């Protein structure tokens, strides 16, 4: 079980760790988060009490290094940093634990929610979507645009999601216009799965990463990407059985976790109605259709 110590908390902030959140008061003796489960990516995220503009945070995996948070009074944010001195880090963490200055990652033993949201998400794929190769962790915030949003502006601060565009030469084979537009199987299976992602695991990893950036940061481009990857599958007549069953599980847990009060901005009526009620896969997403109909029957 790993630890992300904090130097201090000089500004009042709501701190998120994965699906959990804690309020920290200005100059409160908060020195970090312990008992973080090994084996998953994690996200530590922030919303300042005095300016709710810009949610921001860091995707990391404690297997890759020793990470801590330190407030930067110049740039006005909680920054993640890596400590290369193992013994210094171990000594800092031991002192803070001994003085009980850390919150415990509050995982219920029965609760697979985080695994279920991050099953296919891998730090190495995150670092190719979020390009800052000198760090082993990845910064995301509310305002970051996607490569696709930038085509339709600073390339270094962009989310490099895989571009999906249903009315693009990549999506449509010359001579198969109607077929490829009405049945996206070619685009899903040959272009995206065989061509770009190599396998359904990498596709789902990006889908899951896009959802989490949408939910935790209100990142609008991420929300567009999550819906586009759902719609590409639902709009394909030919999809492997294992991918549909897995998609049903992925979406069920995403819909289960989504705060009810955010459904109006995080869920696209057109895409969900089409996917559940009109698409080729309208009858393939039993778990997702049941949770959507019981939790968000207004949207539909």
């Amino acid at each position: 079980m790993n630890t992300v110590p904090f130097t201090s908390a000089p500004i009042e902030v709501t701190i998120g760790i994965d699906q959990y959140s804690f309020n920290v008061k200005e100059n409160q003796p908060f020195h970090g988060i312990k008992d973080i489960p090994i084996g998953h990516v994690h996200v530590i995220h922030f919303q300042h009490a005095d300016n709710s503009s810009m949610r921001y945070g860091y995707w990391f995996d404690c297997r890759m290094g020793n990470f801590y948070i330190q407030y930067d009074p110049k740039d006005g944010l909680y920054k993640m940093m890596e400590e290369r001195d193992g013994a210094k880090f171990e000594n800092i963490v031991h002192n803070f634990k001994e003085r009980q200055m850390m919150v415990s990652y509050p995982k219920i033993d029965e609760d697979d929610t985080w695994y279920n949201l991050t099953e296919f998400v891998q730090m190495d794929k995150i670092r190719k979507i979020v390009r800052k190769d000198e760090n082993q962790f990845s910064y995301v915030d509310s305002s970051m645009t996607t490569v696709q949003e930038n085509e339709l502006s600073d390339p270094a601060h962009s989310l490099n999601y895989t571009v999906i565009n249903f009315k693009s030469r990549e999506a449509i084979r010359p001579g198969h216009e109607m077929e490829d537009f009405l049945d996206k199987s070619y685009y899903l299976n040959t272009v995206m799965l065989q061509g770009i992602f190599k396998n359904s695991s990498n596709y789902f990893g990006e889908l899951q990463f896009a959802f989490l950036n949408a939910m935790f940061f209100g990142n609008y481009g991420s929300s567009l990407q999550w819906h586009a990857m759902i719609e590409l599958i639902c709009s394909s007549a030919t999809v492997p059985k294992h991918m549909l069953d897995k998609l049903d599980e992925i979406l069920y847990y995403q819909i289960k976790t989504l705060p009810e009060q955010y459904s109006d901005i995080l869920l696209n009526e057109r895409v969900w109605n089409i996917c559940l009620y009109s698409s080729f896969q309208k009858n393939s997403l039993h778990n997702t259709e049941k949770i959507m109909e019981n939790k968000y029957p207004e949207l539909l």
Binding site: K167, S168, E177, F181
Partner: protein
């Protein structure tokens, strides 16, 4: 975006543009079967592709053979329209290719957009205009070439005959839409107005009669009267 009354003069500027009307591509007679079920029988159709400035009409005749063994024909008809318009554009020399294609029905937008991805600089636009191009099959010579076709065929017409020798494109389009609106509202009465005087004929190389400027004003008046008469009948007003 969409073409309306605010940007109407845009039709007659020097940017090549075409209207595409797909309303006569898939045409059927509905009939009873021996068992008392209902069945359709396709008849020949046409794509109506018009340059409003020049009057050049690219009438692609859709032969019933194109539907054989196909399903969801009303959907396929939009995609076949888009295919044939795309093929027409690719057949034109670059300096004759349109800068914009305006579809008369919004359902043609995605099919035409997808078929024209190779032409990113050609704008595909809907229109808020209610254009009576469905009545094209009320023009005897266009109906005749469609119904006699035994195979796919493209026929080129000038739908303004020689009008542009005497009138502007704006006026020629206004005359064409009034004629077609009348033919659409009361075909028999419109054709009676157009042909009632035997001394005015249709040239072999024309679609419409050889009216003098004064006779066109009389004809145009009779067409407006027809449309108002029919409106008074529809609504009992």
């Amino acid at each position: 975006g969409a073409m309306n009354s605010s940007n109407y003069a845009e039709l007659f500027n020097n940017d090549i543009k075409l209207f595409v009307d797909d309303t006569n591509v898939y045409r059927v007679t509905v009939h009873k079967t021996f068992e008392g079920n209902v069945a359709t029988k396709a008849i020949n159709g046409c794509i109506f592709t018009l340059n409003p400035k020049t009057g050049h009409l690219f009438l692609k005749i859709i032969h019933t053979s194109v539907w054989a063994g196909q399903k969801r024909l009303s959907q396929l008809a939009k995609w076949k329209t888009a295919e044939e318009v795309s093929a027409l554009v690719r057949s034109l020399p670059k300096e004759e290719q349109p800068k914009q294609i305006i579809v008369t029905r919004k359902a043609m937008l995605d099919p035409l957009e997808v078929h024209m991805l190779d032409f990113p600089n050609i704008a595909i636009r809907p229109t808020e205009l209610r254009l009576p191009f469905s009545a094209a099959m009320s023009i005897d010579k266009l109906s005749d070439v469609v119904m006699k076709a035994t195979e796919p065929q493209m026929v080129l017409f000038n739908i303004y005959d020689d009008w542009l020798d005497r009138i502007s494109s704006y006026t020629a389009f206004s005359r064409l839409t009034l004629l077609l609106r009348a033919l659409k509202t009361n075909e028999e009465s419109a054709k009676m107005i157009l042909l009632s005087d035997p001394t005015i004929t249709i040239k072999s190389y024309h679609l419409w009669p050889s009216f003098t400027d004064e006779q066109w004003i009389t004809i145009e008046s009779q067409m407006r009267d027809l449309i108002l008469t029919e409106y008074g009948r529809k609504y009992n007003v």
